[PDB]
Assembly symmetry: C6
Homo-oligomer: 210 residues x 6
C-alpha cells in the first residue's frame, strides 16, 4: 500500500503477511456474507491496484464469483474510458500519463506508475477508483449468493422476537422495512405491535414483544 511515513511523505509499503493472511482467512470462513465487504475495504486501506489484484488472486475457490468480479471491473473500466479519453502527447517531465481503465485495474500499468499516480500532487487515486469497482462487483456477488428473500423471513409461533428480528435484518442486509417487520411477526406479537401504533422504535417494538 501507499502509506505516509512518520515524516509526512507518501511512500510505498510491502503488503504485510498479516494483511494477506487475514483476507484469505475471511473468505474461507465467511465466503460472501455481507460483512466480507468491510473487511476487504479495511484490509486494502491505501492499497495500490497491484495490492488489490494480489488480494483477489490469493483467493482460492469461488472462481465463479471471481470471474463475475472481472466482468464488473471490465464494465467499470470501459465506462472510465468513455468518460476519460486519454489525450495524445508527450508526458511532461515529472508528470504522469492519464490512466486508462486497464491501468486503474493494474493490467496495463506498472507498480511504479501506480505509485506515481497515487503520490502525485494532486494524486490520482487509482487504488481507490479500483477498490470502488471491486466493492461494486463484490456487492453484486453478495446479493446473488443471498439464499433467502425477505418475504420468507417470518417469526415462528414460539420464536422469540429478538431471534426473528436478528434473522430479518440479516436477510435484509444481504438482499440490499419497518412495516414488513410487523407483517411477518407471529400473531401474538403482531397484535402487540398493532397497539403500539406507528412511529415506534425497534427498541420499543422489541421491548413490547419480549
Amino acid at each position: 500500500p501507499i502509506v505516509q511515513n512518520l515524516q509526512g511523505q507518501m511512500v510505498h509499503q510491502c503488503i504485510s503477511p498479516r494483511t494477506l493472511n487475514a483476507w484469505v482467512k475471511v473468505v474461507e470462513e465467511k465466503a460472501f456474507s455481507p460483512e466480507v465487504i468491510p473487511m476487504f475495504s479495511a484490509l486494502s486501506c491505501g492499497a495500490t491496484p497491484q495490492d488489490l489484484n494480489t488480494m483477489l488472486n490469493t483467493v482460492g475457490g469461488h472462481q465463479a464469483a471471481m470471474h463475475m468480479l472481472k466482468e464488473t471491473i471490465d464494465e467499470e473500466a470501459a465506462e472510465w474510458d468513455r468518460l476519460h479519453p486519454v489525450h495524445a502527447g508527450p508526458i511532461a517531465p515529472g508528470q504522469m500519463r492519464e490512466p486508462r481503465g486497464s491501468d486503474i485495474a493494474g493490467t496495463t500499468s506498472t507498480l511504479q506508475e501506480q505509485i506515481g499516480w497515487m503520490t502525485h500532487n494532486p494524486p490520482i487515486p487509482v487504488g481507490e477508483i479500483y477498490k470502488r469497482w471491486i466493492i461494486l462487483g463484490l456487492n453484486k456477488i453478495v446479493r446473488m449468493y443471498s439464499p433467502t428473500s425477505i418475504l420468507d423471513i417470518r417469526q415462528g409461533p414460539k420464536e422469540p422476537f429478538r431471534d426473528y428480528v436478528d434473522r430479518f435484518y440479516k436477510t435484509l442486509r444481504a438482499e440490499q422495512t419497518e412495516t414488513l417487520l410487523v407483517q411477518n411477526a407471529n400473531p401474538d406479537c403482531k397484535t402487540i405491535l398493532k397497539a403500539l401504533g406507528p412511529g415506534a422504535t425497534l427498541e420499543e417494538m422489541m421491548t413490547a414483544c419480549q
Copy 2:
C-alpha cells in the same frame, strides 16, 4: 485512526488487521456483555468515523442490535443538528465546513473531510463525537439484553457468599446497592451482616460471611 507520528504530527493510519480481528472476535465471544463496551472504546482509540463504521460493519449477526444502534445514532445526529445548525457561506481556504450529524456519522462525509476535522487546530473530534453516540447506543443494547433483574439475585442457602456477590454485581453492572446486597443474602449470612452494622465495607462483609 488518526495517530501522532513519532515527530509530532497527527496523520491518518490504516486500521490494523489486529484491531479489526479483535473487535470481530470479542463480539462473537462476549456478544453484548458489559465488558464489550470498554473493548470497543479501546479498540477504536483515535478512530475516524470511517473506522467506526468499518468496525460496526464487520459484525456479522446481532443485526437486531445493530439496527437499534443506527436508530440511536440517528437520534443523536438529529440532536446534533438542532444544536449546531450549519451556516451558509463559502468555506475559507485551509478551513473545514461545519459538520452535520450525518457527517459525524460518516454517511455524508469523506475520509479526507474527517481527517480535516480531526487534525484541525483546534480539532473537531468527529470521531470521539461519533464514538460517544455509539457507546450510548451500545449501553442501551447491553441493558436490553441483560437477562436477569437484580431483585432475582438471591444467595443460595449453601451458596458461598463470594459466589453470590459475584453474581450480584455482575447482574448490577448489566442492569446499570449495599442494602439490597444484605437483603438478598441467605438467612445465615444476613444475621452476620446485621450484627456488622451499617457502613461496613464489602471486604468486611465478605470476610464476615466466609
Copy 3:
C-alpha cells in the same frame, strides 16, 4: 499509554490490542494468584488513568473483587484529597489544575487533562499514582482469595522436600519463614534439618533432605 517517541517527546499512544488481550487472558487463567499483580503492572506500563480503567473494565466476572477494588480506590483517593487540597484560582496559561483523587482515578478528568499532567515538566504521574492504588487494592484481593494458611502447609511423610517447599512458599506468597519451614517438615527431614543447625541456606536444606 504515554510513551516517548523515538525523537524524545512524551506523546500519547493508543493501548494496543495485544496489551488489552493479554490482560483479559491473564485474569481468565490465573484469576487472583499473586503473579497477576506483576502482569498488571507490566501490561499497564506508562498507562494513563483512562488506560487503567479500560483494563479493569475489560475484566468480565470477579465483580465482587472489582467492587472491593473500587472501595480501595475511593479510600486512597479520599486520602489524596486530605493531603492535597485543591487551591482556588485561575490556572495559568500552559499549566494544569491540581488533580483531585477522582481526577487521578479518571472519573472526573479527561484524557487530555491526564496527558497534560503526565507530560508536564515536572510531570504529575497520575497514572502511576492510580496504578499504586490499584495494586494496593489488588494485593488485598489476592490476600483474601488465598485459600490456605501457612500453618496448614505440612510436608507429607513420603512427600519430596522440594514439592513441600514449593507449596510452602507458594502459600506464603499469597498470604503475604525459615523456622516454620523446618517445623512443618516431616519427621525424617526435620531430624536432618535439626543437625544442619541454624543459618543454613534453603539450598543447603533442600540438598540435605533430598
Copy 4:
C-alpha cells in the same frame, strides 16, 4: 528485502520470521495451486536474490518441482547473458559491475552487490528480474501439476450451476472459455443458456440456471 526507511532512503532489511513462516506454510497447505503464485510475489515484495533463494530453500519436499525451477532459472539466466554480455573493464568508483545471469540468481553475487544493484540510481532490479524468472518457473509447475483438463469439467445432471462454474474456472485457472462453459453444462441448463443468446454475462448465465 530492500525497503525505504521512513526518511526516504532504500536500505536493506532482514527478512522477518513472519514472512519466512508464511511462505513455508502456504507451500505445505496449498502446494502448487494457482493461488500460491500471488502469495509468493506478495511475500517476496522488495526481496533481494538472497531473500528469494532463502524462501525457495526453506521449502521442504516438492524437490521435483524445485529442481524444475532451477532449470527454468538456468534457462532464463542464460538468455539474460545472451542479451546482456558483461563488458571488460575496471568498475568506476561508486559504480556496480554489470550483473550476469548467475549474479541475478544469487549464485555468483554477494548480498552487498545485490544491495548495490538494487539501490543504484538508476537501480538494477536484480530482485525483480530474479522473481520474474521464478514466477515463470512456478507457473510451469502449477500447469504441470494441474490434474484435470477443462474438457473434463462437465456439469452433473443434478449439480447446481454455481458449483459447476466454480469447478470450471478453478480448472481453467490451473490449466492457464465462454462457449465451452455452455457446451459442458447439463441438458437442462444448456437449453436455458441457448435461449439467452450470445453476449450474456456470467451473472446472467448463473441467474438463468439457478
Copy 5:
C-alpha cells in the same frame, strides 16, 4: 528495557506483552532445563532491574527455586557492597548516587534511578549486573534439579550410539568428557572406539559406531 531509539539516544521502553508471555511460557514448559538460561538472557536483553523483577515475579510456581534465587541475589548484593562502599556526600547536579546491592536488585531503587544509571555516560549497567546475579542463581537451580549423574549415562546394549551421545551431553550440560563417553559405551562400540585411538573427533566416533 533501555533501548536505543532510531536516532541514537538510549530511552526507556515498556516491556512488551510478547516478551512477558514468552518468559512465562518457557518456564511452564521447560521448567529449569539448561536451555531456559539462554531464553532468560535473550528475553531480558537491555532489561532494567525493574524488568528483571517483573519477569521473575510473573513466574507462578517453582517458588522453592525462586526463593533460592533471592538468597543468591542477597549473597551477590552483599558482595557488591563489600567491594563498592557508598561514599557520603551530596550528589552533583546531573549525576547519580553510587548504587548499593539492593539498588541493583531493584529493591531500594526507583525506575528513574535505574534509567539514570543505565543511560549515564559512562553508564552503570545495573541491569546487566543484576542479570548476572540472576543467571548465577539460575545456574545453581539448573544444577540442583539435574536428575541424573553423568556416571549413570551408559549406552544400552542395542541402543544406537547417536541416542546415547544425545543423552550423555544432555546430562553433562545440566550437571555443568571424552574418555568417559567411551567408557560408558556398550561393549560393541567400545571395541570400535578403542581401535580408533585417542584424538578422534565426536563425528569420527559417531561414524564408527553407527
Copy 6:
C-alpha cells in the same frame, strides 16, 4: 542483531521473541533436515556472535550434534588464528583489537566488542564469519543424519514418477544426478526415458513418464 536504523546508522537491537521462538520451533519440528540451514541463516540475519550463541543454546536436545558443532567451530577458529595472528601493541583510540577465533565465536569477546567490530568502518563482520562456521558445521550434521543413500532411491513398479523424483532429489539434497535418475527409474519409465535421448529436461522427463 546489528540493524540499520531508519536514519542510516548501524545500531544493536535485542533479538526478538519471534526470532528466538521460530528457531526453537524449527529445530523441534524439522531437526536437521536440509531446509533447517536456510531458516538458521535467515533467522540470524545480522546476528552478532552473542545472538548466534543464544540461538544455539536455546536448542534443547540434539546435544550430540550441538557438540559436533562446537568441534567444527574450534576447527574453524583455530584455522582463523593460523591465518590471522594478532599483533601486539596498544589499540589506537576509537579502534578495535584484531579478533581471535575465540572472539569471533563469542567465547572471549564481549557484546560491546562485537558491536565495535561489526559497526567499524570498514566493519569486521565477526557475526558473518561465525555464522559461516556454524553453517559449515550444520551441513556436516545434516549430511551425517541423512538416513538413505541416493543409490537406494529406486522407483517402485507402480510408483508415480513424480513421487519417485520427489524422493530422489530430497535424498540427494541431504546427501549433498541426471543419469542416475534414469537408471533408478522403473522398467516402464526407463524405456520411455531411453527413447527421449540425452539432454532432456526434468520437465520433459516427468511429462514423458506420467
